[PDB]
């Protein structure tokens, strides 16, 4: 029951500084438009231990499943090869990502009928703001 609140399908309904947060991440400027137009879907479930999010656009799908603590390898949307741990920190899983000297940290929060996504490079945040499809 870990995760419960998390579970379901979730529509993307405001974005704030995305365009910056992918320059601060290193995206480049065809990527950070096309992707920055898109309205993802995100799809979390649990089976026993293993949490799997996935995102579905109209510019990339992607698919993770972990479990929490136990670093995985992913491929993310904007092609980086990382690697990546999320843990669950009081009611907030929290995805770190590293690669190439680099590090990046979304936090993923329940409030009120939300899920809020907040996603930190250096001094930059960007928060995307979801709710039930
Ligand atoms: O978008 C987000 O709120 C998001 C926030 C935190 C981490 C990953 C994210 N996004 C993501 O994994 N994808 C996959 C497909 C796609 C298309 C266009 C823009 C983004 C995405």
């Known amino acids: 029951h870990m995760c419960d609140a998390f579970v ?23 990527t950070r438009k096309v992707a920055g137009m898109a309205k993802p879907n995100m799809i979390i479930s649990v089976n026993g231990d293993v ?31 990382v690697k990546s741990t999320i843990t669950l920190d009081g009611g907030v899983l929290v ?12 936090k993923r929060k329940r409030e ?5 996504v907040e996603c930190v490079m250096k001094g930059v945040t960007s928060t995307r703001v979801y709710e039930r499809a």
């Open 95 to 106: 995805h770190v990502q590293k690669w190439d000297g680099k590090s990046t940290t979304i």
């Open 8 to 30: 379901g399908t979730w529509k993307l309904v405001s974005s704030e500084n995305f365009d910056d947060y992918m320059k601060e991440v290193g995206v480049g400027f065809a």
């Open 112 to 116: 009120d009928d939300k899920l809020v």
């Open 51 to 81: 949490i799997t999010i996935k995102s579905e656009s109209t510019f990339k799908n992607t698919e993770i499943s972990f479990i929490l603590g136990q670093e995985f390898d992913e491929v993310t949307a904007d092609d980086r090869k």
